[PDB]
């Protein structure tokens, strides 16, 4: 039985498939595995959709669009299922960042290579999606961090001329992982946080939506074969929650 | 009676007070107006505090800190009141951005001057604060946008040599206001959204926290005198909601 999901994962690695490219394969498999439903991969959400979705939740929400063609374009596309009611539900939104470049094989033409805040931008890309899914009970948002800024553990790298640079993960000048954390409420890095955790403060059960932030904190880059299962775990749990709204399409017999 | 809050607002403008500087004056007034409470202005929140605050809500939340001295530093500081229980509550967190510079009095040494995404960074600065206040019933987060990227209406500017550049607010190449919108759920730009609006989907009342995004969409820069009342409106509503937890400190007689 360890077949199709096997051969796909291999093919991912055997071509060092892009994060965007992986999601397509993921739909390819997502379909092959539950072939009763109709899966679709797309790569942008028109800023409109978010609003349309928001008014649906509340009239007073989502009522501003200044540049019509505005859209959210997550690096690794989006995979959606078609629910019993003919709408499309979100299953996987992947994105991968590469802030680093201090270790792999006065400012110059380009800035000093020490630290940056390029990752803070995920301002737009997450908030927009979580809002587009404000009426869902899951947030299959996956982020793959990769670079000499997102180190979890310490590692020491040898140099051309003997020196074995010892990079302390928690060096202020080199760790940017902490700017992304607010995106999950301080929860466990590298964990499938696909299912919404309902906190409740003072008689109120307010819903948290956390982005599953993953990172190869040893410095080594992402192994595509693995990027497949990861996304596939998120995916499955998305179908796990969308179960009741998929029921009969599954009950074709 | 239109006295102290008058003279302060004037002094703000009469010195073109910085957004950070205004908040201090705002505390100065916030105190002078309700002199029973103890107000304090600070300018950074140690990444720790957020976590401490988060565990308090839920043990499984806020359990990651990679670079100890990490902190959220909002441009315009923070103003807090001291509640009946000796803790400090958030009253005002102001921040102002200036993405623009295409109108006021091939790339060069610096990039082509047309459009940028520098505002998307507010990834960190808001999510961090709203999380630090996940147990409050208000989000006094105020953002002041200013620049030739945040135009609401269209304006045409004359040039050195006669030309009267006609800038269409909704030109794709020049409008960046739409990247900030997800920060308020599509709600009204330039409005005191200090009070949390509890939406409810499928038997659930999930809490929304929106940042009151303000903008001088005519191109003209921010008039400090006004930046005072604005922040003061947010402030007051923060005390409006923190009323029950301030009660007796107000009942000194």
Curated annotation (Swiss-Prot), chains A, B:
Residues binding Mg(2+) 2, per UniProt: 75
Residue positions of the active site: 75, 95, 97
Origin: domain of life: Bacteria
Keywords: Endonuclease, Hydrolase, Magnesium, Metal-binding, Nuclease, Plasmid, Restriction system
Entry's Gene Ontology molecular function annotations: DNA binding; magnesium ion binding; type II site-specific deoxyribonuclease activity
Cofactors required: Mg(2+)
Transferase keyword on record: no
Effect of residue 120 to Q: Inactivates the enzyme
An annotated GO BP: DNA restriction-modification system
EC code(s) of this entry: 3.1.21.4
Catalytic reaction(s) noted: Endonucleolytic cleavage of DNA to give specific double-stranded fragments with terminal 5'-phosphates
Disulphides: none
Cofactor: how bound: Binds 2 magnesium ions per subunit.
Positions of Mg(2+) 1 binding: 75, 95
Quaternary context: Homodimer.
Family: Belongs to the EcoRI type II restriction endonuclease family.
Name the UniProt record assigns to this protein: Type II restriction enzyme EcoRI
